[PDB]
Write a structure and sequence with these properties.
Three copies of one chain form a homotrimer. Helix content of chain A is 52%, strand content 18%. The first copy, chain A, has three domains: 42 residues, Single alpha-helices involved in coiled-coils or other helix-helix interfaces (Up-down Bundle); 87 residues, Alpha-Beta Plaits, CATH 3.30.70.1820; 70 residues, 2-Layer Sandwich (Rec A Protein, domain 2), CATH 3.30.250.20. At the A-C interface, helix 1 and strand 2 of A face helix 1 of C. The complex binds chloride ion (CL) (2 copies). Chain C: It comes from Homo sapiens. Chain C: Homotrimer (via coiled coil domain). May also form larger homooligomers. May interact with DDX39A, HNRNPA1, SERBP1 and YBX1. Interacts with TEX19 and UBR2. Interacts with MOV10. Interacts with APOBEC3D; this interaction inhibits LINE-1 retrotransposition. Chain C: Keywords: Coiled coil, Cytoplasm, Nucleotide-binding, Nucleus, Ubl conjugation.
């Protein structure tokens, strides 16, 4: 009597909690992605200089002078470029926040066209500044990216974390691994090649 | 047997959990309000262009040319850009170097009443966060009823509601805060009971 | 109704999940709160708050930019002997966005070393622009801060809201009250002193 009814009520409560728990999960998840996007957006005027030798008492002024050198040696075409701030975070990466986004895009463009950006002979690496999340997503493609590279698919990663490669004289784009699992399911060649990596 | 114990402990857990959740609920909404604001703050210099025909292979420079076209065609008297990018043609987002610049564009667009591009009507709006715009729209119905009964309402930033109750202006961040308010004022409650979904 | 022992056993299991999922989602929530704290602070780096400035009926960027100059002319002459991206209201506060962070840093040190800042004689203030999370994070390190300070523990506040004091002849850092709890759980003297504050 009194006991049986107590049980049923509890079961309804537990389920209700499970439901409210779902709608909560969704909202949290939406905030996570919302943070990811805004982080990226805010880091748009930002460039990452990689492989730049560390220095003693490396203040803002020295950094700026360094960026100048990099520009004079690689693409002096530019220019004094407006720098809102520059700082350090294997040498520590250097983050550069340009006053105008246009300035960054132009420098990246200059780098990717040049190919080998160097500093006094030593190769360095200029790259976009991404959020932890986005940056992590890109790393997860890693394993697959290499296999594709190996088999001459000419893979490429672009914003946010899109994978792209050649399949049938056409370039294919994939936002996530799931979308890719669907693609290969109808192409035995790729399916066999990417069975383990995709965890299918 | 003596299940009374186990089933009682379960109920206790159940209660605990319902309180646990309510707390997390609070913190989540807090973060949601913080995102709304941070987005609003960031996109403050941004402006939204709707109804602009897509162009085959259109670089960012052509986008800027399209911007200047609209300025000449609608605002003769009237420009620094950090960026202008795309998102039925996609919305175009124009980010000005100064927030002031955006404000003058909207005023001119509102004083002109109608904005065109090559003879075709387009639209100029802000770039407020999705969470904000929706929020503002949700106060709509209630705002209409309050205006009707001469409460002199007002919707400000972010999406605060403010009207006159007892010769004293009151502010409401969300609908819930309003529900608790009317709980001690029968007449008002009776007025907004259908709108508050109570 | 003897099979009731069946249903109850499961309900106990369901509750265990709800608890796990509950704590796990909670961890994500905090990671989000912490993330917002981080990005809000970052975005505001080039900012300074002007507090106590008499507002007018109708203002604008230019009229405000002049007022900003009067403050410099009146308080820090050798400082202007100043690149401003934009300035505007949120008497409301006035958010001053500099072109270069280094600039903001400089003037802040000028306002802090002058101690007393005035506009036409009227006392005003220039302060760092910090997130609401960080502020309240510091505010949470309030009572606990006063207890250590009063008992001569040399407590300090390291940005963002890191609490640090000297015990056992060493210097410890603490991000959240939780970590501090883990610490005093083994220091009877300290524990007894910080039990009321940590709600322990
Ligand atoms: Cl929950
Ligand atoms: Cl959250």
């Amino acid at each position: 009597d009194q006991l049986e009814e107590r049980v049923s009520a509890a079961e309804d409560e537990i389920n209700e909690i499970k439901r409210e728990g779902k709608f909560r999960e969704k909202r949290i998840k939406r905030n996570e992605q919302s943070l990811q996007e805004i982080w990226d957006y805010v880091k748009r005027p930002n460039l990452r200089l990689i492989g730049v030798p560390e220095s003693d008492v490396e203040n803002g002024t020295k950094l700026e002078n360094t960026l100048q050198d990099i520009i004079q040696e690689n693409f002096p075409n530019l220019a004094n470029v407006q720098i809102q701030e520059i700082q350090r975070t294997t040498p520590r990466h250097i983050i550069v926040r340009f006053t105008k986004v246009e300035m960054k895009e132009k420098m990246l463009r200059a780098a990717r066209e040049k190919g080998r950006v160097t500093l006094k002979g030593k190769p360095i690496r200029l790259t976009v500044d991404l959020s932890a999340e986005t940056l992590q997503a890109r790393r997860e493609w890693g394993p697959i990216f290499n296999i594709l590279k190996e088999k001459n698919f000419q893979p490429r990663i672009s914003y946010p974390a899109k994978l792209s490669f050649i399949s049938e004289g056409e370039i294919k784009y994939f936002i996530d691994k799931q979308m890719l699992r669907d693609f290969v399911t109808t192409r035995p060649a790729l399916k066999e090649l990417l069975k383990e990596a995709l965890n299918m």
